[PDB]
Amino acid sequence: PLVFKLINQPRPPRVSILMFQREFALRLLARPGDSLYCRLSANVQMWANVTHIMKVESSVVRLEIKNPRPQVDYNEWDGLLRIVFVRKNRTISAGFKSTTVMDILEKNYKTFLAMNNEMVDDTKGSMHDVVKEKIDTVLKETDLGDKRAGKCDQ
């Protein structure tokens, strides 16, 4: 949350000079194929352009918030990168049907279909449907699921 305080504020400043710990500065500058790669790497790498100057152990790092902010909702992206970054070494299909992840996700889906009014069937996922298998269908539909969290891009 050290960079979260300067990623979403109103009236973003010109520059940002600051000293942090060096390993978080490695997390903001981590390549996607690394074990040092994390969620906050993606958070800076499409919300806050960042590079390392003035190595002090501590590190100085420089941040700039992109004033044409790309239209990505932070809540859903933050939640999905959290639930695929906590299970970093695991895959993505079986990790969602966890115990209580598989309550809160279809709570988010039922609020997501509250303005859509989609009919929830009696088929609903334990054999072939939305709590269990349509999640697998829509991760098959995109670039995720089999490619792990240390390989997927933005």
Indicate the SS3 state at residue 28: helix
Decide if 31 contacts 149 (C-beta within 8 A): no
Question: Which region among 17-25, 62-70, 72-80, 112-120 touches RNA (by CB under 7 A)?
Answer: 17-25
Residue 72 found at the interface with RNA (CB under 7 A):
no
Look at strands 48-55 and 19-21 and give their pairing: unpaired
Residue 79 found at the interface with RNA (CB under 7 A):
no
Residue 100 found at the interface with RNA (CB under 7 A):
yes
* Contact pick of 95, 109, 129, 152 for RNA (by CB under 7 A): 95
Number of residues that bind RNA (CB under 7 A): 29
Nearest 5°: the CA angle 119, 121, 123 is: 160
The strands making up 48-55's β-sheet, listed across from edge to edge, are 19-21, 58-65, 48-55
Residue 141 found at the interface with RNA (CB under 7 A):
no
Residue 132 found at the interface with RNA (CB under 7 A):
yes
Distance CA 73, CA 77 (A): 6
**32 or 116, CB closer to RNA?**
32
Reported in sequence order, the residue ranges of the chain that DSSP labels E, i.e. its strands, are: 19-21, 48-55, 58-65
Residue 121 found at the interface with RNA (CB under 7 A):
no
Residue 142 found at the interface with RNA (CB under 7 A):
no
Q: Which residues bind RNA (CB under 7 A)?
A: 1, 21-24, 27, 35, 38, 57-58, 86-91, 93-95, 97-101, 126, 132-133, 136, 145
